[PDB]
């Protein structure tokens, strides 16, 4: 078996989950268009009653230029004109723990 769920049983499992989730449905026929309209109005769902979306749409210069000129040839700060994650520190911690644990045996 190995795996927790063989794909070929996915349809049966989903069918049983659906059966458990929706135990009662509305299976009463209507007789004319007005009844269908009323039933559609009555069964409305808040999560499926939104509206259609909206169409998608599209003096200091001297100071800025002076700063840009003054930052000439700056390797790192010039490009910007920053989300630390401490990855090197965590790598160091992991390696230190592994080395200490290995030294425990010896």
């Amino acid at each position: 078996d190995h795996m927790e769920l063989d794909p070929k049983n996915i349809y049966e499992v989903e069918a049983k989950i659906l059966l458990a989730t929706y135990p009662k449905l509305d299976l009463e026929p209507t007789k004319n268009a007005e009844e269908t309209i009323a039933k559609l109005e009555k069964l409305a769902h808040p999560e499926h009653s939104h509206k259609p979306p909206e169409p998608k749409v599209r003096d200091e210069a001297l100071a800025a230029e002076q700063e840009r000129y003054m930052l000439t040839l700056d390797e790192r700060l010039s490009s910007k004109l920053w989300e630390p994650r401490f990855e090197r520190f965590k790598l160091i911690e992991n390696i230190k723990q592994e080395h200490a644990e290995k030294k425990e045996q010896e």
């Binding site: 927790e4 769920l5 049983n9 049966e12 499992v13 049983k16 989950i17 458990a20």
Partner: peptide, 30 residues
Amino acid sequence: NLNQIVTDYLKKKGFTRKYLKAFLLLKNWI
């Protein structure tokens, strides 16, 4: 067994255990 899988899934999901019409109808019957 599918029953075991379904039960496990459900447990892990926190599932607790007006007059014109009448006139026309009458005329048509008549």
